[PDB]
Amino acid sequence: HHHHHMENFVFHNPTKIVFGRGTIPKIGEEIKNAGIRKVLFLYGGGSIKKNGVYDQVVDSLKKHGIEWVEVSGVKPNPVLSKVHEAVEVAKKEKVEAVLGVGGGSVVDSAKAVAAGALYEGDIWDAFIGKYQIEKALPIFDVLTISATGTEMNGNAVITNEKTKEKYGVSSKALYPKVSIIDPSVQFTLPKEQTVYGAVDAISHILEYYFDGSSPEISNEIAEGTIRTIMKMTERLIEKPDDYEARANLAWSATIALNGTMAVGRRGGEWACHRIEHSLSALYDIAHGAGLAIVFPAWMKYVYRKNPAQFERFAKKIFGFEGEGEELILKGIEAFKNWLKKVGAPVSLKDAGIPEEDIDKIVDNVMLLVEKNLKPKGASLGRIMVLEREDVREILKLAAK
Amino acid sequence: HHHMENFVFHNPTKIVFGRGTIPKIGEEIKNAGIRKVLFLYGGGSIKKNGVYDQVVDSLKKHGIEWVEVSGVKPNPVLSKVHEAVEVAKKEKVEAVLGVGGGSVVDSAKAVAAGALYEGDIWDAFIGKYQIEKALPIFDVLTISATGTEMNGNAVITNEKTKEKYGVSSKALYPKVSIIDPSVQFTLPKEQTVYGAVDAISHILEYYFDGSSPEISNEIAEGTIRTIMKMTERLIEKPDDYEARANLAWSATIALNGTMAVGRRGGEWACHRIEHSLSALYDIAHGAGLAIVFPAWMKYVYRKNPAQFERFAKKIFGFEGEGEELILKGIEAFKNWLKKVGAPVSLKDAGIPEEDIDKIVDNVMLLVEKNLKPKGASLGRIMVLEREDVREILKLAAK
Ligand SMILES: NC(=O)c1ccc[n+]([C@@H]2O[C@H](COP(=O)([O-])OP(=O)(O)OC[C@H]3O[C@@H](n4cnc5c(N)ncnc54)[C@H](OP(=O)(O)O)[C@@H]3O)[C@@H](O)[C@H]2O)c1
Ligand SMILES: NC(=O)c1ccc[n+]([C@@H]2O[C@H](COP(=O)([O-])OP(=O)(O)OC[C@H]3O[C@@H](n4cnc5c(N)ncnc54)[C@H](OP(=O)(O)O)[C@@H]3O)[C@@H](O)[C@H]2O)c1
Ligand SMILES: [Fe+3]
Ligand SMILES: [Fe+3]
Secondary structure (H helix, E strand, O other): OOOOOOOOEEEOOOOEEEEOOOOHHHHHHHHHHOOOOEEEEEEOOOHHHHOOHHHHHHHHHHHOOOEEEEEOOOOOOOEHHHHHHHHHHHHHOOOOEEEEEEOHHHHHHHHHHHHHOOOOOOHHHHHOOOOOOOOOOOEEEEEOOOOOOHHHOOEEEEEEOOOOEEEEEEOHHHOOOEEEEOHHHHHHOOHHHHHHHHHHHHHHHHHHHOOOOOOHHHHHHHHHHHHHHHHHHHHHHHOOOOHHHHHHHHHHHHHHOOOOOOOOOOOOOOHHHHHHHHHHHHHOOOHHHHHHHHHHHHHHHHHHHOHHHHHHHHHHHHOOOOOHHHHHHHHHHHHHHHHHHOOOOOOOOOOOOOHHHHHHHHHHHHHHHHHHHHHHOOOOOOOOOOOHHHHHHHHHHOOO | OOOOOOEEEOOOOEEEEOOOOHHHHHHHHHHOOOOEEEEEEOOOHHHHOOHHHHHHHHHHHOOOEEEEEOOOOOOOEHHHHHHHHHHHHHOOOOEEEEEEOHHHHHHHHHHHHHOOOOOOHHHHHHOOOOOOOOOOEEEEEOOOOOOHHHOOEEEEEEOOOOEEEEEEOHHHOOOEEEEOHHHHHHOOHHHHHHHHHHHHHHHHHHHOOOOOOHHHHHHHHHHHHHHHHHHHHHHHOOOOHHHHHHHHHHHHHHOOOOOOOOOOOOOOHHHHHHHHHHHHHOOOHHHHHHHHHHHHHHHHHHHOHHHHHHHHHHHHOOOOOHHHHHHHHHHHHHHHHHHOOOOOOOOOOOOOHHHHHHHHHHHHHHHHHHHHHHOOOOOOOOOOOHHHHHHHHHHHHO
16 A cells, blocks of 8 residues: 655745844835835734834835835734725725735735735635636735744635625735744734644644645654644743744744645645634634634544544654554544643634534535635545535534 | 744745656746757766656647757766857857756756856856856756755866865756656666765754754754655665655755754855865765765764754654763764765775875865855854864774
8 A cells, every 4th residue: 555655746935034033124125126116014903013013114114215005904804895995095006016014814915905906806706716816916024923824825815794704815926025024023922812823833734734645754844843833832821922932933834834734745635724714704713713623623523534644643743652543532632632721712612602503604614615615626625525514513523 | 052043035946746747847948938948968867768758858849949968977067067058158048958967957057157157157166256147947857866956056066176166046046847756766776875865964964053943953853864764765666656756855855945944054064075075086975975974973063962962862763861872873874874885984985095185185275265255164063174174084084
């Protein structure tokens, strides 16, 4: 048998990363050197003004002769109305690029605005298979929360509040030109956000790790990165201004979804993520919080379809020795327990979502499959494609 | 400590990897807007193993016109680069397509630069010209070792001066590199092994540079352990595709920037000493590293003891502490290299101990002519003087 095949792949990631303390003043230099004179400066709720990130950025833009217009108020699960608002500004002000300053919600919004600025229609079309994004304005970002790896990929997730649809799109045109990551600006993050961001980065790795593939080099890199994220999370809970922890976690989040973990694999599973979108769409919970609930339940539901990799998970992430269903369940339980330790919800009840809502959540998941996945030939899950009834059982596993 | 150093990461090269991918070469060239290329290659292995025919068929299919220059040598020489630069210019090629190993891809990089330079491209290797622009470079890689397929480096030997020098430039990053690991099945065992030693050595030049960030250590250690496992498999079964594929990607990430993140720029003493061995005796790059690296480790470990402890625990699974552990790990590394057939002394390579002073002279020249113009020095956790280089070579002699 041949369960460790390294799949054919194409790898291409042109994004420039500028990383470390004191790097944010380079943002104006990067934009100037990229030949850009006028940007839309997009941001969230003004944590960036409060922590001095805004003044570092503005001082750099002013120093390097960059003109800008601001749009603020991007929300943590970003919404389409705000993208619409910003697209109108970008078009009316003739901006040459979009500069997102904030967390994943801002950088995803920046991508969606960069695409929409070059599209005649409603950019929501791209999230429901009615428009393939081939071109976008250049995107620059100053990242202030490490979680999603959006700073170094072509993905964006937006919620249409009108329809309660939280959907993703992926395009080469949405890779940032330059992303600046100063991990020290993360010292002020709430503990819960730090942890949710770690859970997200781990989950991105696991979506690939569990896709049925098992190349040796990819397993090694995945495992090393998971172990690093876990260690750093624990440090950050105790000491939120531990720079090396922030820095290690930041880069691990970046590589989790920059193409690194995809190499040699089968494209990833993505069932947990797509299920979680419906929780965030319906309840506005943190992405990472939803994943802490769904992932362990999914793992318990599916492991017989990929047992050797669940055994390797137990051995390589947690150091257990053994074989079979016992070892598999030991590893899944340790994962659930670690999530609980660091304070993440591991049930719907932990998050205040009642059991009697399950069927409503399942309806939302199924709509996502029809409207977001089917148009691009995607399906829910890979090692096991999940039908309505499978989604219901997983949520019932995660209910209490 | 375990500080994660500030860094800039940028690697725009596209990789197309796997079985049956070489037919994409003409498509990639076409899609890049290019019609006429210089097809550069080595000593003829590609004509005996089907690669030449795959490339030519793809170029024909996609309307790509080409001129050829062959004869690139395993330690590539400046005279052949000169020949190819003249053909490039005379024939108005729009890109350079290197099909072969690292010697060929490095030569393609040098030719792509020299094609746009009025002078002798050797200037770039001695600090007299800054390569800011070069023709587009494409490559079909047939041996995994150097990672040249996904970086901006090139090393060329000026035969007239016995100087084997490196250059790095953003302009030398390939546009597209195609890696079909299955074409490596025909490699002699020695070349497979020298390739693996070079990949491991790239990782270690970063691993031992004084820095020790957790994420960078983990990625390095997992990559080295994989290379070692796959090398052993390939010595027994050269047509083990998964072993070739895993080794291929490991060698790519070893020097594409992945190992540099959060570190201090790398040590590079072993590489730069080795270049003198290859300049003077024409030995394989990786063979020389097998000789120099263990000696260098034995010489310098007191300057970075904690990382040498970690090397022993993480690569070999040894337990304990301090110098006993450090020495166990270094000896295990040397013995592994010996096990897989690499030379681990100058004697193993047919190099006389009496020649150490002539080798040292060449190393010192490299320092004056290649390193100092670019503000670089021989070593980092210990800068190496003439005497230190001599002591390292003595430790490597037998
Ligand atoms: N594109 C992708 O690769 C991808 C993949 C998976 C998930 N996602 C998406 O990304 C979004 C999640 O983004 P995220 O996890 O990065 O977090 P986020 O939603 O952007 O931010 C969460 C919270 O953190 C705060 N914050 C950010 N930086 C801070 C700082 N340094 N100090 C103190 N507070 C700070 C924000 O407040 P302020 O507004 O005041 O700054 C906000 O309330 C979700 O919509 C998810 O679906 C994208
Ligand atoms: N740029 C960088 O990142 C960097 C870094 C370190 C070292 N280097 C340099 O790279 C060079 C070494 O390159 P390399 O290790 O890749 O080896 P190479 O010198 O390009 O090739 C070594 C031998 O392998 C043969 N060969 C290649 N592919 C084959 C195949 N698939 N089947 C059978 N034989 C095959 C060649 O024969 P044919 O000629 O007949 O094809 C040649 O004799 C040195 O000059 C070294 O200094 C570069
Ligand atoms: Fe996510
Ligand atoms: Fe090398």
